[PDB]
Amino acid sequence: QISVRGLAGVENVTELKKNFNRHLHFTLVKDRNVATPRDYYFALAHTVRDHLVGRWIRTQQHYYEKDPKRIYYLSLEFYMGRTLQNTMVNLALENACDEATYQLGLDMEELEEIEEDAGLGNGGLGRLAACFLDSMATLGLAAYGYGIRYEFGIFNQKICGGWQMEEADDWLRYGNPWEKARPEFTLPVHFYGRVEHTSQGAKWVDTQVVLAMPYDTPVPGYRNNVVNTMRLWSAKAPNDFGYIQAVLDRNLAENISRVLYPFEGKELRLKQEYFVVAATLQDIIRRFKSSTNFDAFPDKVAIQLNDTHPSLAIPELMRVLVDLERLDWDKAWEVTVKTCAYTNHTVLPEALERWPVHLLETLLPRHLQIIYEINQRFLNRVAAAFPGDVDRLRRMSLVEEGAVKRINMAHLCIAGSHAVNGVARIHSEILKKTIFKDFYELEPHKFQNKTNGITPRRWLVLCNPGLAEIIAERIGEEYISDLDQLRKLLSYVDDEAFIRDVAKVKQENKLKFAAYLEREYKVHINPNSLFDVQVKRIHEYKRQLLNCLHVITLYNRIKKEPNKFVVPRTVMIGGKAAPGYHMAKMIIKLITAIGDVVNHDPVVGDRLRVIFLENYRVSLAEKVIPAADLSEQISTAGTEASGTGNMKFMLNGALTIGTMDGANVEMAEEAGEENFFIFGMRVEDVDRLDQRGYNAQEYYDRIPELRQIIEQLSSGFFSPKQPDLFKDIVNMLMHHDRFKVFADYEEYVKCQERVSALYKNPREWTRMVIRNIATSGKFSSDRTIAQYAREIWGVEPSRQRLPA
Amino acid sequence: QISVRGLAGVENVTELKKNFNRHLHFTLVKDRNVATPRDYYFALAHTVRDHLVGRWIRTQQHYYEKDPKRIYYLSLEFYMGRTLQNTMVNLALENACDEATYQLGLDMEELEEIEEDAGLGNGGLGRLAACFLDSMATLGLAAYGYGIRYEFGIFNQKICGGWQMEEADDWLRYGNPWEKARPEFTLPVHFYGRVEHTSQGAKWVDTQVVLAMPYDTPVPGYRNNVVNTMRLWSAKAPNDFGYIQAVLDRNLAENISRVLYPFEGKELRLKQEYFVVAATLQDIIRRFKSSTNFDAFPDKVAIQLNDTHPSLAIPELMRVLVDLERLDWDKAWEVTVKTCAYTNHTVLPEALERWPVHLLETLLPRHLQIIYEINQRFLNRVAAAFPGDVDRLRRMSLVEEGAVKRINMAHLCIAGSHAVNGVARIHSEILKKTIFKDFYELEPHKFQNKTNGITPRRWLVLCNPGLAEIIAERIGEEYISDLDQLRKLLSYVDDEAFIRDVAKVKQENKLKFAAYLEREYKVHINPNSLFDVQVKRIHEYKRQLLNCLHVITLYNRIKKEPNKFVVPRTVMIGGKAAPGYHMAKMIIKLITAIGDVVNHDPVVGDRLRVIFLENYRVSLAEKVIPAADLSEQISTAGTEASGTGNMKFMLNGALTIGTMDGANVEMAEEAGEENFFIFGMRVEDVDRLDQRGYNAQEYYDRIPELRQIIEQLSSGFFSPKQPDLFKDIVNMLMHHDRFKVFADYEEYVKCQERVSALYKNPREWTRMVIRNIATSGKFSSDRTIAQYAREIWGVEPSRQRLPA
Ligand SMILES: OC[C@H]1NC[C@@H](O)[C@@H]1O
Ligand SMILES: OC[C@H]1NC[C@@H](O)[C@@H]1O
């Protein structure tokens, strides 16, 4: 249909049709009589997979020949979403498949909707890694994603009477046609045991052996015929493991790759972490030996560590080079530091892993020895650089004293890596000034920034084809792999035909999403209202509560002056809470409770709707973001390391209400502050407040509108049958608010009125939109990856094709 | 190469080659560079599978149209062996594939050897069901095998210092290309719960739901284009089943289809049994409704129950018809009796399932109620037929008193079935006279015989192509689906060219197997010796111990007169012992212990070898039976219900040494007693001995040669480092021998001398062989199945093709 999807020729369409029939017939073992839409989805998925694998074989063939420096991206989270459309777009098969399935009496869009989201990630970190794989392939890097094939992803979220219910994600129930099991490349991973010393170094012995089975998923670049590999590890018990009981207990080892953790210091967590690290490192070493001399290892291998999760890669690499390959400490260490780099994804104190010594002792005794020995040599470097600074010595130690003895894994990461980066400028500055100040003063050259990005493939071409077409009409298709080219849309801010087109696309997207809400969730929304959307994980730092306070203000204002005009709004909030995070679960209930009162008040009518979006995930993100008018990015300054949803919204025609936090600062810098709704405390202001002490009572005393809301919550206004249901929320807001919701309330409400004012003038809104879209180029993951490649890994990106 | 495999044409071979490459490329995701022989095996297996599925679809399509009476064969054992060659032969693809793989630089025979045996059965019962599926498809019956997809089969047997070690059978490690998972046809199976009564009948409530997932395996008929289905059930936990623990405990439900039991009254056993029954019955009912009126059910459905294992099918069918479909008792019962039939496979007291009431109460409360109610109505039938016979009432009851209360499942089987059969004439007679006398006197018309059979496809054409070719040269190919035609070989017993050919085939088979022993197991055997082979499960009734006593006699005779001529022999014994069957495990050790002494005695030389065959299984049976001269079938009279190995040997050119037990009686009747080495007690003689009382001491007192052997065993002759190792064996032989080994010793040794005498005259041996092969026609499973079809199920077999 459109230009951004490819050619629907004569030979391709005819050839696709007979491969569809072949897979339905031979692969699926069905005919037209018993074939359900799911079988049709599988037949198409298998047919498209055929074109991937041909390119996949050639790519790995190619890397064998050229022998380039290999990048290893290690994450415990790969938040992939659906694969079919992404695959069709990157291979230029979308129109051929659409025409081909049409000629068969099939709707392709109906088929796409049957694919389950890969349950392989939680949130930002996981989606980031997905965007990166896409970018890495698009830029011709010989890169590998490595992680765990969780049998059950992050839970599916169901709402029952306003409460989050968790239910298992059986995304694999019907099979995954994209993955290829590789049982022939299975690998031992060791646990417990003991250390023995011999005239010939240390030996790890009497170990429980868990086997690690790899599944491979192809990762297609954008129209460059490069197809990289994402390799995911599954746990499988060994074969010599009454007789019936020995076979049943094989389940115990296989529990490692069973569930993604929604930092909780459980053993199973540590085991997952070592599991992915150990198998991955064996694979990396094996691949390098098919190039003896580990001097060249850093020129052939780059390993990127994402948060403290794969931190054990450092002692593990040491263990292999020292105990097994017989290299001297100093040489092994030189190789480890040059190979590894460390990205920090968030400063949240409750996410920087600190393991108890008594646990590493039991589970990985040799690793503890290596850590102690790393710590010792590192501390002599500190001692010699800062003579007499004993407090620095204990601050910088990898070992923490007091209560239980712990190993700070972030400190390990810094010591054993040649580069350390944060994920947006302000965040990387914060690392340098606060939590890693000591390490920065010792090695200022390790510390870099790499502002996060999103892929324009999924996050524009795939999810918003309408917008993608009108851009291409004016400036052509080159922007898809070079998003900076969107600057050229600046010369169109005054063009009347373009203003109308941007506004029409937005309204089409809104109408569409409005109709999805009704069909699948029977809830009725006004499509000409302002689509006010906050979508991300539920957490107090993200301050869904601040949004809640605004929604109630608008409602109270409508009740006070009902016959006075207000810009209508649909307020949408979606996100999962962590299962044991009580406050987050209460917030969800608060939101749905506000909906119950507001959506059923006749005096309000269709002027305010509060909708909770159930089971927020990648594929729901692809539907809601194109339809949004207002992006809520309202974390307390200094808490959101970057964010990436914000970039998704910028790129899709939403204006942003936000604090100067994470990437917001750089988004506002790129579009100009005038084109951005910035409100609230900067980082400096939060610090000043922290010094004097935060007293929420003061805000309750001076702001009558806020006082009313607190009273309403306390007295059961939003919970008539359980008057004191939100007592924990009120009590937290009043006495124990770490994120200072009340302090940003006034300026947030004031900013919101300005958002409303501007929306009454559609023409000016849309011009402001154009200025955002036109300046979103910096936020491409192509740009991010290009920077990692040049400043960290030491490989040159490439835009060159591989033969078809 | 040969005529019995098909045409290797021009279009087929060319077309097979590009499908081989397609699966290697696209299915396997490999190229010539990384492709191991296993990948080549998988590429061929996938290519041949393509031709199956085309016929598979049409067959089920066909049955939908014609709507024939459907046969359901229920077994907890399906002992399938390898599938590739069987598949090639039945489709007539063997020569096309051989030529096709040759043109690619591949040896097909090398590839065949990479396929693992389906770990889905234990022994006779399991192999019987396999032969039957083959026969049912060959004879055009709309039949379905139903059972459990055990994740780990029967253990693999390893010998370590003469002892059986059990190790898990991970036959699925690399995947099974023959099966098709069907997640879309998953089914609930209920456990525990309670019964509630309502104005509207009984209700089963508060049940644990285990889900039952079906895997389908195609079952090709012989060159008739019929392809039936074998459906196997896998356990999978439900979706609403801290949060981490709820996901891990999903393993508990999935333990149902985890391991085949090597009758042990465990709960997990009962659960497996109910599991297969419940899901199977739901499937049967569903299929019948796509024909309201359950009067026609018996005309559309036949269910065959194999031993007491699927006995719960009877109360389960009642439960569905009464509680769910709302039929009256009497009508439901009429339907159940007409649908079900029961085969008994062995009279072994320790294999007739008797479950404790307290267990059925807990696990299946409604089923217990239905059983009690069945028992009540059945006992009124007994009371009215035999007025005043109270002991008959308690003998015939489904409920047993004393100690723990038990349900006799065999009694249930008889009451709720319209036919009951044994598996060889003598065995069916025994059922009528002894263990089911009471039931026979009440309903003489239920009781039938159906002598077991083997398939000539696997057990001649597949395993012995050499013999298959020389037969076809003289009489053509028609015998493969009509084995009675072997009678025509009678007119050849005096033909000189045929005598030589039979003898040459045998020697080729022997040379071949001799060379397999050396390569894979480095053990050196004389190929001109008499190949004396006893292969079957190790059990005292099978009397491997009697064979052992002969081997030691021969050895002692050689030591006494070393320079006297004896017909050289290789004595081969193979078989698995049940893990907790102590005596059987000791017997194995005894056999290997005899080997240690005998194979290393210089004075013996290559005149006697004792080899234990490790890990006896279907594919080893396919190698050893063609190579055998002497078939040991030496169970105590009245203990072997039929046997089937015996028929395998008869058909492959071995003479038989045996007791008049099971099918031996009918084999001797068909070939004439003169052409058979019958020895020992008949059934009548065992009875007479049982009456007087068995005193083994008496035989030890009168037979000096036997006395010597006992002394040797006791004094540590075969166990020098552990003198008293075989004390349990001696002690059992002497005081607690239930199978009367000593009583058959003299006549067994005497018979063995006659076997030896005849072997010195090769020409007469081979003529006697011809007379056996020529009369083995009755033992075809085609004949057996034809009889089940006509006398039990009420369907007419057919030899007609389906379109190609
Ligand atoms: O770096 C991935 C994510 N970590 C926390 C967010 O601020 C950031 O986008
Ligand atoms: O009927 C299957 C098997 N049960 C015991 C054996 O005698 C018989 O072949």
PDB file of C-alpha atoms in Angstrom, chain A residues 127-212:
ATOM      1  CA  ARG A 127      13.828  -2.542  25.757  1.00  0.00           C
ATOM      2  CA  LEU A 128      17.111  -0.641  25.541  1.00  0.00           C
ATOM      3  CA  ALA A 129      18.955  -3.896  24.785  1.00  0.00           C
ATOM      4  CA  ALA A 130      16.353  -4.700  22.113  1.00  0.00           C
ATOM      5  CA  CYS A 131      16.798  -1.332  20.390  1.00  0.00           C
ATOM      6  CA  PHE A 132      20.601  -1.824  20.601  1.00  0.00           C
ATOM      7  CA  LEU A 133      20.523  -5.261  18.903  1.00  0.00           C
ATOM      8  CA  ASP A 134      18.472  -3.729  16.073  1.00  0.00           C
ATOM      9  CA  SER A 135      20.945  -0.812  15.816  1.00  0.00           C
ATOM     10  CA  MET A 136      24.029  -3.046  16.032  1.00  0.00           C
ATOM     11  CA  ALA A 137      22.812  -5.196  13.121  1.00  0.00           C
ATOM     12  CA  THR A 138      21.785  -2.085  11.141  1.00  0.00           C
ATOM     13  CA  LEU A 139      25.330  -0.742  11.586  1.00  0.00           C
ATOM     14  CA  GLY A 140      27.125  -3.968  10.585  1.00  0.00           C
ATOM     15  CA  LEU A 141      28.720  -4.816  13.914  1.00  0.00           C
ATOM     16  CA  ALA A 142      29.567  -8.429  14.605  1.00  0.00           C
ATOM     17  CA  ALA A 143      27.522  -8.344  17.831  1.00  0.00           C
ATOM     18  CA  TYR A 144      25.842 -10.951  20.040  1.00  0.00           C
ATOM     19  CA  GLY A 145      23.141 -10.472  22.661  1.00  0.00           C
ATOM     20  CA  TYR A 146      23.534 -12.976  25.501  1.00  0.00           C
ATOM     21  CA  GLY A 147      21.026 -13.667  28.256  1.00  0.00           C
ATOM     22  CA  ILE A 148      18.524 -16.127  29.673  1.00  0.00           C
ATOM     23  CA  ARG A 149      15.637 -17.861  27.910  1.00  0.00           C
ATOM     24  CA  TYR A 150      13.142 -17.423  30.740  1.00  0.00           C
ATOM     25  CA  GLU A 151      10.434 -20.085  30.341  1.00  0.00           C
ATOM     26  CA  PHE A 152       7.928 -17.661  31.857  1.00  0.00           C
ATOM     27  CA  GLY A 153       8.531 -13.978  31.207  1.00  0.00           C
ATOM     28  CA  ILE A 154       7.491 -11.139  33.431  1.00  0.00           C
ATOM     29  CA  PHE A 155       3.966 -11.892  34.616  1.00  0.00           C
ATOM     30  CA  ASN A 156       0.904 -10.834  32.698  1.00  0.00           C
ATOM     31  CA  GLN A 157      -0.979  -8.182  34.627  1.00  0.00           C
ATOM     32  CA  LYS A 158      -4.730  -8.546  35.258  1.00  0.00           C
ATOM     33  CA  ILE A 159      -6.814  -5.988  37.109  1.00  0.00           C
ATOM     34  CA  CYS A 160      -9.480  -7.426  39.474  1.00  0.00           C
ATOM     35  CA  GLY A 161     -11.620  -4.869  41.275  1.00  0.00           C
ATOM     36  CA  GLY A 162      -8.831  -2.318  40.843  1.00  0.00           C
ATOM     37  CA  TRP A 163      -6.035  -4.580  42.109  1.00  0.00           C
ATOM     38  CA  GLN A 164      -3.060  -5.959  40.165  1.00  0.00           C
ATOM     39  CA  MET A 165      -3.240  -9.734  39.853  1.00  0.00           C
ATOM     40  CA  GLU A 166      -0.124 -11.561  38.650  1.00  0.00           C
ATOM     41  CA  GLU A 167      -0.497 -14.491  36.291  1.00  0.00           C
ATOM     42  CA  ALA A 168       2.214 -16.560  34.583  1.00  0.00           C
ATOM     43  CA  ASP A 169       3.333 -15.628  31.065  1.00  0.00           C
ATOM     44  CA  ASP A 170       3.192 -18.840  29.055  1.00  0.00           C
ATOM     45  CA  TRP A 171       4.453 -17.121  25.896  1.00  0.00           C
ATOM     46  CA  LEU A 172       5.904 -20.446  24.763  1.00  0.00           C
ATOM     47  CA  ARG A 173       2.702 -22.534  25.054  1.00  0.00           C
ATOM     48  CA  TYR A 174       2.319 -22.821  21.255  1.00  0.00           C
ATOM     49  CA  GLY A 175       6.041 -22.680  20.481  1.00  0.00           C
ATOM     50  CA  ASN A 176       8.427 -19.972  19.268  1.00  0.00           C
ATOM     51  CA  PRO A 177       9.100 -20.200  15.510  1.00  0.00           C
ATOM     52  CA  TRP A 178      11.837 -17.583  15.705  1.00  0.00           C
ATOM     53  CA  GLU A 179      14.210 -19.460  18.022  1.00  0.00           C
ATOM     54  CA  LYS A 180      16.484 -22.338  17.123  1.00  0.00           C
ATOM     55  CA  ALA A 181      17.436 -24.778  19.891  1.00  0.00           C
ATOM     56  CA  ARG A 182      21.100 -25.779  19.734  1.00  0.00           C
ATOM     57  CA  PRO A 183      21.430 -28.902  21.962  1.00  0.00           C
ATOM     58  CA  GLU A 184      24.764 -29.773  20.346  1.00  0.00           C
ATOM     59  CA  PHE A 185      26.415 -26.679  21.920  1.00  0.00           C
ATOM     60  CA  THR A 186      25.418 -27.412  25.523  1.00  0.00           C
ATOM     61  CA  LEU A 187      27.866 -26.390  28.250  1.00  0.00           C
ATOM     62  CA  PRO A 188      28.632 -27.244  31.906  1.00  0.00           C
ATOM     63  CA  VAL A 189      28.167 -24.601  34.616  1.00  0.00           C
ATOM     64  CA  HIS A 190      29.532 -25.393  38.108  1.00  0.00           C
ATOM     65  CA  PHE A 191      28.237 -24.635  41.580  1.00  0.00           C
ATOM     66  CA  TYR A 192      29.319 -25.095  45.228  1.00  0.00           C
ATOM     67  CA  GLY A 193      32.351 -27.410  45.456  1.00  0.00           C
ATOM     68  CA  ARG A 194      35.631 -26.441  47.135  1.00  0.00           C
ATOM     69  CA  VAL A 195      39.064 -25.033  46.319  1.00  0.00           C
ATOM     70  CA  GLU A 196      42.184 -27.210  46.440  1.00  0.00           C
ATOM     71  CA  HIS A 197      45.729 -25.870  46.094  1.00  0.00           C
ATOM     72  CA  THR A 198      48.442 -27.787  44.266  1.00  0.00           C
ATOM     73  CA  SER A 199      52.058 -27.124  43.308  1.00  0.00           C
ATOM     74  CA  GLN A 200      50.199 -26.251  40.096  1.00  0.00           C
ATOM     75  CA  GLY A 201      47.800 -23.449  41.133  1.00  0.00           C
ATOM     76  CA  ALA A 202      44.244 -23.623  42.480  1.00  0.00           C
ATOM     77  CA  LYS A 203      41.568 -26.140  41.415  1.00  0.00           C
ATOM     78  CA  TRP A 204      37.792 -25.939  41.689  1.00  0.00           C
ATOM     79  CA  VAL A 205      36.481 -29.414  42.611  1.00  0.00           C
ATOM     80  CA  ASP A 206      33.399 -31.399  43.795  1.00  0.00           C
ATOM     81  CA  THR A 207      31.050 -29.168  41.857  1.00  0.00           C
ATOM     82  CA  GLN A 208      27.380 -29.611  40.997  1.00  0.00           C
ATOM     83  CA  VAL A 209      27.165 -29.461  37.189  1.00  0.00           C
ATOM     84  CA  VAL A 210      24.150 -27.690  35.633  1.00  0.00           C
ATOM     85  CA  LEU A 211      24.001 -27.847  31.821  1.00  0.00           C
ATOM     86  CA  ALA A 212      23.373 -24.726  29.749  1.00  0.00           C
TER      87      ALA A 212
END
